[PDB]
Amino acid sequence: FDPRPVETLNVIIPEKLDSFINKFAEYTHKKWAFDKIQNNWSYGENVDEELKTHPMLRPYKTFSEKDKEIYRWPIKESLKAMIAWEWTIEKAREGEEYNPQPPDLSGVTLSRELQAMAEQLAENYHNTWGRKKKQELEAKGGGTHPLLVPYDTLTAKEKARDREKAQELLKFLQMNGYAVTR
């Protein structure tokens, strides 16, 4: 297994997409926050597993730029991968879109083409993780990991997390009236 994640260092995301990045970042936070709250988690100055408190259990708008970046960076990385593949992301249509009530993406259907595109994004997520994992293993004294194989050899249950991340992005894009082609 020789993972080659797409280089995004010099890939520039158009300024106009800043709005979607922030919106999707907020959505991702709402999703995380919603789950935590349903599990009796509350706001606290410090992260506490026993008291189930978390300082980030608060409106995304009240976050500092560093905290917002926790959500925005992974999103920018996905977009930079898409731009690197010369995919087109154009606002075509108007979007169909402490108690966080995040939008329900359960009813969003991706075309076969967008699902196919989600596969390439998911593969890149796996190659990114793989390349980072190899560098971690060596830094820690060597070793191996069972998931260090090509994406296509992974089982369905193993592809799941990568697929859902790719689906979430493409769903929210579509829900906001963005058309994605190649």
Curated annotation (Swiss-Prot):
Q: Where, if anywhere, are coiled coils annotated?
A: none
Modifications made to the protein after synthesis = The N-terminus is blocked.
Q: What tissues is it present in?
A: Detected in skeletal muscle (at protein level). Fast- or slow-twitch skeletal muscle.
Subcellular location field = Sarcoplasmic reticulum membrane
Q: Where do the sequence repeat units fall?
A: 1-97, 98-182
Free-text note regarding domains? The calcium release channel activity resides in the C-terminal region while the remaining part of the protein constitutes the 'foot' structure spanning the junctional gap between the sarcoplasmic reticulum (SR) and the T-tubule. Pore opening is mediated via the cytoplasmic calcium-binding domains that mediate a small rotation of the channel-forming transmembrane regions that then leads to channel opening.
**Its biological function?**
Cytosolic calcium-activated calcium channel that mediates the release of Ca(2+) from the sarcoplasmic reticulum into the cytosol and thereby plays a key role in triggering muscle contraction following depolarization of T-tubules. Repeated very high-level exercise increases the open probability of the channel and leads to Ca(2+) leaking into the cytoplasm. Can also mediate the release of Ca(2+) from intracellular stores in neurons, and may thereby promote prolonged Ca(2+) signaling in the brain. Required for normal embryonic development of muscle fibers and skeletal muscle.
Family that this chain belongs to? Belongs to the ryanodine receptor (TC 1.A.3.1) family. RYR1 subfamily.
Any further remark recorded for this protein: Binding of [3H]ryanodine indicates that the heterozygous channel is activated by Ca(2+) concentrations 4-fold lower than normal. Single-cell analysis of cotransfected cells shows a significantly increased resting cytoplasmic Ca(2+) level and a significantly reduced luminal Ca(2+) level.
Description of how the protein assembles with itself and partners: Homotetramer. Can also form heterotetramers with RYR2. Identified in a complex composed of RYR1, PDE4D, PKA, FKBP1A and protein phosphatase 1 (PP1). Repeated very high-level exercise decreases interaction with PDE4D and protein phosphatase 1 (PP1). Interacts with CALM; CALM with bound calcium inhibits the RYR1 channel activity. Interacts with S100A1. Interacts with FKBP1A; this stabilizes the closed conformation of the channel. Interacts with CACNA1S; interaction with CACNA1S is important for activation of the RYR1 channel. Interacts with CACNB1.
Tell me what this protein is called: Ryanodine receptor 1
Q: Which organism is it from?
A: Oryctolagus cuniculus (Rabbit)
